[PDB]
Amino acid sequence: KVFGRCELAAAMKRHGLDNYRGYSLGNWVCAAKFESNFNTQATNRNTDGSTDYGILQINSRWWCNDGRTPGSRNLCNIPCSALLSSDITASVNCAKKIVSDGNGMNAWVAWRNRCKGTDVQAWIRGCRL
Ligand SMILES: [Cl-]
Ligand SMILES: [Cl-]
């Protein structure tokens, strides 16, 4: 599914991400924009053999199992394929674990490089939340 901007903002809001660990909703929408372009089915292979899955490009090296990332972990205890659903619940639940981890939203490269330190409030402008 390719979410509309406000459609995704509203979905993330009702799943409790607005100001989760201090990160305003616009940060989560911005992250999703530049990780997946709002496409729940987005996947990308990394140089080390791990793969990033879904709307927030959650990595198989640490967070989910795909059975083809040797020596990796599955800290969200879910198959990576579950992170590709049209329903963002699984990705959000996993994202909440990730962001509580240590480096916060710096765990998302696109967030750190393209959202952090910018005006993210624009990502939810005009949305019914
Ligand atoms: Cl909507
Ligand atoms: Cl293994």
70 burial (CB, 10 Å; 0-12 / 13-18 / 19+) is exposed
Catalytic, out of 18, 35, 66, 87: 35
Contact 25, 109 (CB under 8 A): no
Cα 125 to the center of its chain, rounded Å: 20
| Distance of alpha carbon 47 from alpha carbon 77, whole angstroms | 23
The ligand whose atoms approach the alpha carbon of 67 most closely is 2
Q: Tell me, in angstroms, the distance from the centre of ligand 1 to residue 15's CA.
A: 13
Catalytic, out of 7, 52, 87, 119: 52
Can you list the alpha helix ranges (DSSP code H) found in the chain? 5-14, 25-36, 89-99, 109-114
Is 7 marked active-site?
Answer: no
Resolution, given in Å to one decimal, reads 1.6
Task: Name the method of structure determination.
Answer: X-ray
Q: No. of H helices and E strands in the chain? A: 4, 3
Domains and CATH numbers, the chain: 1-129 (1.10.530.10)
Is 66 marked active-site?
Answer: no
